[PDB]
């Protein structure tokens, strides 16, 4: 099934980069119907600008230059029932720095009930130059080198501790 | 003078043969439903010729007496009943035509009286049901109390629908549900999940949900199932757990509740089933067994060239070696029938009818020749003989003659049973059956025809006059008591465990208390207690320098430290818990995904270290002459190729992919250290070459059924569903394929579909009797049959409808018959082990067998110094009042009216009688706190050397505390779950009933002794639900979504797994769970699909995987609860002679 | 026939209230746009019949001159009632008074006939 996973906060620079926006029904046998709506902010700016709006199935993209002909869809395809609003950026810049925000205007469709919600996503991502690896992954490596050598560690110990006191228990005789 | 010849007319053969003949006839005529017109004559001769058979025998008894000596004989009075009725109804009657002509029914228990031999079995009955007396208080005791727990834990719970949010015209709730009355109406409000007639269930915790976007969970309107499936009342919850208790749909009411509640609540399922339904059940088994045996074992304690012809012939037939040859014939005939499917080629058509001519001349020239020269009188003496002779008859039958014709050739196979010793015990049992308790078949057959006839003459005029209740196309349903023969399916569909899904509709058409009591006395009378007598009997019938050595030495002193040992236990717990965690949500908490990857390489270095270890402390000679250490290298191996692979790189492909799912199989190293779980192994072990072989009998007795099953329904289960409804056409357009695929490419969405378990093959056959021979997804399969016409011709509706038989006759044989002696040979083979191991237990480890030694220590024969008096007078009388037997009784009716108390609670109770009993209930607590203190300020310094006096003191404290807690949550918090939980504390005082109640306290003290076989039992079953769980979380996530398979219920975390795999624990709903994997190859799916929010694609599972997954995990249950099952019969015999 | 009873003579006084009594019994539930309920009238018993009191989606009193504005529903049909009242009875009031319910999706339709006698 569907699950909603939080955006990568971190892109670099001269790459490519997918901004996750995950947005699934609370049952999905519900035939809804949703398009979604992009607006961000550069770093230090007071604004939300719109970007680019995928309504039914066409994309088209704002008049905004920070992101004209760097930027294509990486969603659902051809569902009328999205349920997935991730976009793709090529060749990220240092302008892809700052508060995006995805909107998805959800219209459901019941027997003679037609509901009309909308979730709002929020992603901050921050561009550099080299990929961090991040501190989770590098301590996580790092214990596992610890854990390693310490758990050899103390098996050497006992063995050379019982090895010694079983042999002046051999020579005993 | 005439009294001499009413005498000698009455005790005479064909008297009594000739009254047998008229109540058979009798028999015959009462199945009619609609007698004509020329019948009442006829049956005017009935009741005349009853009542000259009364008036013969009163004119041979009484002599104007007052008829002593024929009324002192109580088998008279039916006869008696029989006549005046019918004289009453014959002349003028009231209105109550149906329910005074339904009264003529016991012109069948007659025969009962006719048929000598017949009196003495139900005598049997009548007997072991007078046993079976304190199990029937001990159930309907626990029923009540999980009643009670299910009823302040869920009260209205199951009314929680997913109401509108925008409604319209000012309305509101009240002001709409005081107007709607009609489904479609309801449907404009409410969720209704495409479907169902019971609008969907949701719930306000964050797990059970889940109203979908617009709708908001309200408590308003009907429980599900016409309003029968609820926990408002004492009554429905009783009801609900006697379907609980005898696992009658149970998994549906499990999903509701877990649906309405909360996914929590899997632990009241979970202790309701594996303590009330299958103890309970099992001690029905154990109560009846005994009551059976004990009673069973004080029971029984040219003519020169003719002749030279036949020399020639009887030489060349070579007794000794023929025989082999034809076994081996008969045995590739039995192959060579089993290949036939619907999808064939003419070649294999044509190659079948050849190899099967050509093995029937064989056979028929082999017979003919041994017949002529063994004397055909010397060859008709015996029975193989006349069997052969018979089977070459049918045969040649199909020289130059419809399947039945051919499918009497399938019973070839039973001329193994000369040289098969377990297809002998086979034969000796289904003959038997025919034979010495023919009595106890025919017992069987009488109350099923009984019970069907009364069923019909009560209800199936209500289902005619109007199905408009049960239905919505205003016809029969399938199951209905309007017929005989369906009034007989109905009684044989309760037989089996099935009573509720057909008594809600029964109910709604022709009342509650009518179907509760036929449902009930056909439900008791058949399961608790026949149904259980023919299991009874087959368990009695099958009862009767050299530093490299002082290296070595350091090694193994290590090795076999505890403290290592513990450390890789530890370890081993820690390595399966992580993989709980790789669900479909671990896209997400990315830093646990990180952590576990490196951990797995952290664990599979301390693995191989450990084994390298083991193989420097072991040598190589005690390594792998050792089947747990085999196991654990295998594993190790496997582990050390999928991290070298992951390591190297260039390792995603194929194989070594699958290789890692077999991840799933690492809590397989727990095995070798809980010996737990190694003793239940050892048993299983110990028992599995008697399993083999009568699993050998069993699958070629089922391949017989599944070769007549095949030639019955092979490829008669496609159907043009309409896919939008999953609606059947109608038959009347579209009568076949050709039709089908002309309306396909005329419209859109038609789809002519396969049943997905059917018998177009051999495999799907054994698949399909696997089913019904569980009763768990049979009716599909049942329905299908008895709708099919032909190979490609849309099915009309029970168009066959005798196709019932055949399922009735393989239930009957192939699932009760061989599912029955499976039991009786596991547990004479548990017997024997038990015997073998020096008379001890085969599943407690040594620890716990001291722990149950000294657990049945309590069960003294010495009554204990009461306590000494106190020399104060004042407290002495108090002393005197409190310990007298009155004291007592007054208790136990206090608490009896406590329990009476909390029974008349229920939903939408007035303001005022929530309040009245709150204060009865205040009143309850108080004197039962100043009797036990009054008591305890008599006996200070004794009372707490009593376990029953502590439960009361520790009940008393936990229900003053649950009561001011509520007060305290009044004041202070808001929380209604916990509110209900703490208020679940209640329920000790009514469980101190069992203090005083000896013929339930015995059977308590059972079920303790038998607990730890059953915590052994049950850590392995854990563990193997734990290792399907991990296999379902990867194989069977993402799979389609239907039938068992759903939101709440699925393989996508390891708690809906684990729910998923309990609910199949006890079989339930596997049919359900397997039948979204079954499908692939779309329009059944689509193979590769999105699935946002992760890498996989397509929405199926390998149909190959989910067969042997769902029908392994169901085989291993099966053993296991033959496993626990004897632990509850050995307990109980311990308990009962000791 | 549809289990329509009724008290096949109903003998008032002249001048007292006069309920005609009938039950209707069929299976299901009563539907409004489905439950129609129609009373007739006849002097004698081969005398044309005089709609005076239908239901149809509501009670519709047809006002009859014969009986002024004396006629009343008396009934809750979702009940299986569909009795009517005629206040301060006549003598002109004897004669032949029939109801008719028609209840989908029963196909059948009950009737039910009441003799009025008028006494002095
Ligand atoms: C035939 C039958 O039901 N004899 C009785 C009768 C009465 C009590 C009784 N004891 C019981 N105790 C506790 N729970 C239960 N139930 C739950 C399990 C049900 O079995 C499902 C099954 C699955 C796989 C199998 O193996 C496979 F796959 F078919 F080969 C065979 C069976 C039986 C009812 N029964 C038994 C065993
Ligand atoms: C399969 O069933 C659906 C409804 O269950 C049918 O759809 C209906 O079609 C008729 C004629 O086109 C329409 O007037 C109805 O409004 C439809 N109902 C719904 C609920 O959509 C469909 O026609 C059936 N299939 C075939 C081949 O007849
Ligand atoms: C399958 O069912 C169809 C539907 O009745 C049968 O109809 C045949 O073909 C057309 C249908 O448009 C009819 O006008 C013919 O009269 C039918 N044939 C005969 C011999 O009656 C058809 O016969 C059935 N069997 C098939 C197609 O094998
Ligand atoms: C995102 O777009 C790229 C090309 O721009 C494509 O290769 C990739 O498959 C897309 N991602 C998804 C999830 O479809
Ligand atoms: C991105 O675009 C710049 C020019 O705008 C170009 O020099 C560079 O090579 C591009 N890099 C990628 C990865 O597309
Ligand atoms: C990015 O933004 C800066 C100002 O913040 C602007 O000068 C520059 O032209 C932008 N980049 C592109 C490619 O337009
Ligand atoms: C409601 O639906 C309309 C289109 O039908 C859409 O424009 C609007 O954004 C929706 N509003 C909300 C709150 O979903
Ligand atoms: C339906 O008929 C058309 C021509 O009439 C044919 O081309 C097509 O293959 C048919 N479809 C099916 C499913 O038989």
Known sequence: ?173 | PLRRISIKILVHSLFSMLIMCTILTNCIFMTMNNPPDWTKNVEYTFTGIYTFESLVKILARGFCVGEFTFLRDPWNWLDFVVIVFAYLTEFVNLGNVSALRTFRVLRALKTISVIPGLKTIVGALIQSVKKLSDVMILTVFCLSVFALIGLQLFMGNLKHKCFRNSLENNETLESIMNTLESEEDFRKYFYYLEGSKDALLCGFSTDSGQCPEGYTCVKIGRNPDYGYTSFDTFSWAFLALFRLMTQDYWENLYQQTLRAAGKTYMIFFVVVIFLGSFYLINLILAVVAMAYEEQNQANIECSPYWIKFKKCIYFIVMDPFVDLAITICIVLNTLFMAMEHHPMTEEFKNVLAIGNLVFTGIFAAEMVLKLIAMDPYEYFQVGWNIFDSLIVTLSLVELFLLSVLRSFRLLRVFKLAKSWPTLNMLIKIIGNSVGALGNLTLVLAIIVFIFAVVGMQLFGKSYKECVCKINDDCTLPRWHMNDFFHSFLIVFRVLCGEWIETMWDCMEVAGQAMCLIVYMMVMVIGNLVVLNLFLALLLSSFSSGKIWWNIRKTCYKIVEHSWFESFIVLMILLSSGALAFEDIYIERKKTIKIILEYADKIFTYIFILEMLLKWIAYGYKTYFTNAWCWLDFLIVDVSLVTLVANTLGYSDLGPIKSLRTLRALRPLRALSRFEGMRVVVNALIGAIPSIMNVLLVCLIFWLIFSIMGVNLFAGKFYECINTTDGSRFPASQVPNRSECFALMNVSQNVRWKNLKVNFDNVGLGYLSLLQVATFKGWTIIMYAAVDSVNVDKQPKYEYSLYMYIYFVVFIIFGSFFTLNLFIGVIIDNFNQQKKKLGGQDIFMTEEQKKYYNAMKKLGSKKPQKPIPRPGNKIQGCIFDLVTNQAFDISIMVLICLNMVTMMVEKEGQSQHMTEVLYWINVVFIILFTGECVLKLISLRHYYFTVGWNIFDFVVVIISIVGMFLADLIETYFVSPTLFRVIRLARIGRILRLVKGAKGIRTLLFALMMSLPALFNIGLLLFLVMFIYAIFGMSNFAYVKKEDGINDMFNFETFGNSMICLFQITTSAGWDGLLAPILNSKPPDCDPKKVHPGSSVEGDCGNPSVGIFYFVSYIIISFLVVVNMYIAVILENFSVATE | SMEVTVPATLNVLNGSDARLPCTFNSCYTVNHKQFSLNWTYQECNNCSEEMFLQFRMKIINLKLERFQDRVEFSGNPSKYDVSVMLRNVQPEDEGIYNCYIMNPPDRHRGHGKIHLQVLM
Not at chain 1, 153 to 160: D, Y
């Open chain 1, 1 to 173: 099934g569907c699950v909603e996973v939080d955006s990568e906060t971190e892109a670099v620079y001269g790459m490519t980069f997918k901004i996750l926006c995950i947005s699934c029904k609370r049952r999905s046998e519900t035939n809804a119907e949703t398009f979604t709506e992009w607006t961000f902010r550069q770093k230090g700016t007071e604004e939300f600008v719109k970007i680019l709006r995928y309504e039914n199935e066409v994309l088209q993209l704002e008049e905004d230059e920070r992101f004209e002909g760097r930027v294509v869809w990486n969603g659902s395809r051809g569902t009328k029932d999205l349920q997935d609003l991730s976009i793709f950026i090529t060749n990220v810049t240092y302008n892809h720095s700052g508060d995006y925000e995805c909107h998805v205007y959800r219209l459901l469709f019941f027997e003679n009930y037609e509901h009309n919600t909308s979730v709002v996503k929020k992603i901050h991502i921050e561009v550099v130059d080299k990929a961090n690896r991040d501190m989770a992954s590098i301590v996580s490596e790092i214990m596992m080198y610890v854990l390693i050598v310490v758990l050899t560690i103390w098996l050497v110990a006992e063995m050379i501790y019982c090895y010694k006191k079983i042999a002046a228990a051999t020579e005993t005789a």
